[PDB]
Amino acid sequence: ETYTVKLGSDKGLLVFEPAKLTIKPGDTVEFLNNKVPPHNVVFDAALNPAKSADLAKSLSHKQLLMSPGQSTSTTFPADAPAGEYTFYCEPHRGAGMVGKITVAG
Numbered sequence: 409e410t411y412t413v414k415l416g417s418d419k420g421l422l423v424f425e426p427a428k429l430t431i432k433p434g435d436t437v438e439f440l441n442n443k444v445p446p447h448n449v450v451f452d453a454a455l456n457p458a459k460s461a462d463l464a465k466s467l468s469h470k471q472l473l474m475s476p477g478q479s480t481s482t483t484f485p486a487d488a489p490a491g492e493y494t495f496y497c498e499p500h501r502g503a504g505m506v507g508k509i510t511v512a513g
């Protein structure tokens with residue numbers, strides 16, 4: 409299944425919309441640049457079920473998305489470990505642009 413997370417709400421808030429999502433291993437999350445760019449998508453190296461920096465890096469998109477309508481996607485590994493994956497937008501982290509994906513069966 410492919411799910412869409414907007415970067416910046418339609419109201420213009422510095423949030424992911426939605427900010428929490430439950431998926432299965434192998435699902436894709438599309439991150440769509442929506443409002444108040446630039447944004448990026450960085451998975452936390454410690455706050456994933458494997459506490460694996462490499463895993464987090466593989467899921468992340470560090471380059472800034474500059475224009476509304478740009479997108480990037482993360483397809484989770486087929487054997488992604490179950491549990492919680494915290495991610496954030498680097499420029500807007502301090503303003504609260506933090507999200508969480510939960511992988512479950």
Ligand SMILES: [Cu+2]
Binds near residue numbers: 447448497498499500
């Ligand atoms: Cu942002």
